Write a protein that binds this ligand. Sequence first.
Ligand SMILES: [Ca+2]
Ligand SMILES: [Ca+2]
Ligand SMILES: [Ca+2]
Ligand SMILES: [Ca+2]
Ligand SMILES: [Ca+2]
Ligand SMILES: [Ca+2]
Ligand SMILES: [Ca+2]
Ligand SMILES: [Ca+2]
Ligand SMILES: [Ca+2]
Lengths: 145, 145, 145
Amino acid sequence: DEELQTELYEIKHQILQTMGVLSLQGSMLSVGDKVFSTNGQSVNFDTIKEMCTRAGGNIAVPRTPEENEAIASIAKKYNNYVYLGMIDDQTEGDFHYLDGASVSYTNWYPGEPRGQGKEDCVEMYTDGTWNDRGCLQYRLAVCEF
Amino acid sequence: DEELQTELYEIKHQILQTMGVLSLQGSMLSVGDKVFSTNGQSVNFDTIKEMCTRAGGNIAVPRTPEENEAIASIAKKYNNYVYLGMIDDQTEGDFHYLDGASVSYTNWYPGEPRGQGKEDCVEMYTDGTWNDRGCLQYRLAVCEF
Amino acid sequence: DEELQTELYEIKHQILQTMGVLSLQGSMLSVGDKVFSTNGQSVNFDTIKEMCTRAGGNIAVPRTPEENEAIASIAKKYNNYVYLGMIDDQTEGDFHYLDGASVSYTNWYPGEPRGQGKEDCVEMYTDGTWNDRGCLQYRLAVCEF
Ligand SMILES: [Ca+2]
Ligand SMILES: [Ca+2]
Ligand SMILES: [Ca+2]
Ligand SMILES: [Ca+2]
Ligand SMILES: [Ca+2]
Ligand SMILES: [Ca+2]
Ligand SMILES: [Ca+2]
Ligand SMILES: [Ca+2]
Ligand SMILES: [Ca+2]
């Protein structure tokens, strides 16, 4: 159509308007094709996971420096550590994303991970570096869509 | 096109991102094809109606158990009763949606409706059950889009 | 397709749902094809400009009476003057939009603009009328998308 193309413009325009409003007001962060957001709650790993999937997203996990920095700023903003979408329950010391694939990008705080098999989750410090941790602490719920 | 299909993916993806953010942050509830939301205001029936249409939606009305429960949770959350998008002004005892069609799904509190012709509106209790009421009370404004 | 048309309906519907939620909750104002929004911050001209572009929009500028009134209501709501997307730095007394084009619609407060070359920005009073001003004051950041 010709009508299809102007309908698409309008749709794309309106999308960027809503994204713009949410962005301007700090409701979320856009990094490439990824949108990060938090409900401000501090809960444990399993709770965060459910909150995120209930909203149609997933517990956030950084796969690039820019994505890592985005999540870091939210952690900084809320002054709380953040549980990341990765665990090493399956095999010890081998952290994997929740789809089962092995993590590639890492930003471990020097010396980490250590403490080992008692600590199967990953938390992000407010400077963006990571620490392996037990999964029952109260951490800021950050989701990716 | 081939380009059309990847443009559509992207558009659909971005939509679900904005919906995800609004959902995660409690700005609205998605139930099937219906989105519920409130501005937190307690006003009378006529005012709610205007607020909702000004936003491009309508005063909420539940047509299923799940929809009813969704509105109920908002009522619970704000600890206030909710005016529903239905009245019986036309014929007495015959409640109709605002398009004029007769209500099908009901969730009357036992004994309701009673009091009759002096009470042409419907309010939802915080447990989700309904009570027929005068239309001039201050009730939580919940809209559907 | 036939499938394309029902996919488009759904997409358009969901867009209006998110816009409806943002609108109902006062997160933004829709005027024709333009969406206005604020982050509530009072900062100077250069800062507002950056905030708006970071969100994928621009510092707001009214080109119609309705658009002017929309921005005015936000100014009223936040009880603060608003920097508008226009300056007269290039040539003195000749105010232009930030794309360089000359402003057409104006709503100067009677007597304005005056003070002249020391005042290259434009602020909106809470009644919607304009005043030319220095660019270093703290004003409400209102963006258009
Ligand atoms: Ca272990
Ligand atoms: Ca471990
Ligand atoms: Ca550790
Ligand atoms: Ca009656
Ligand atoms: Ca009645
Ligand atoms: Ca009654
Ligand atoms: Ca000058
Ligand atoms: Ca000047
Ligand atoms: Ca002046």
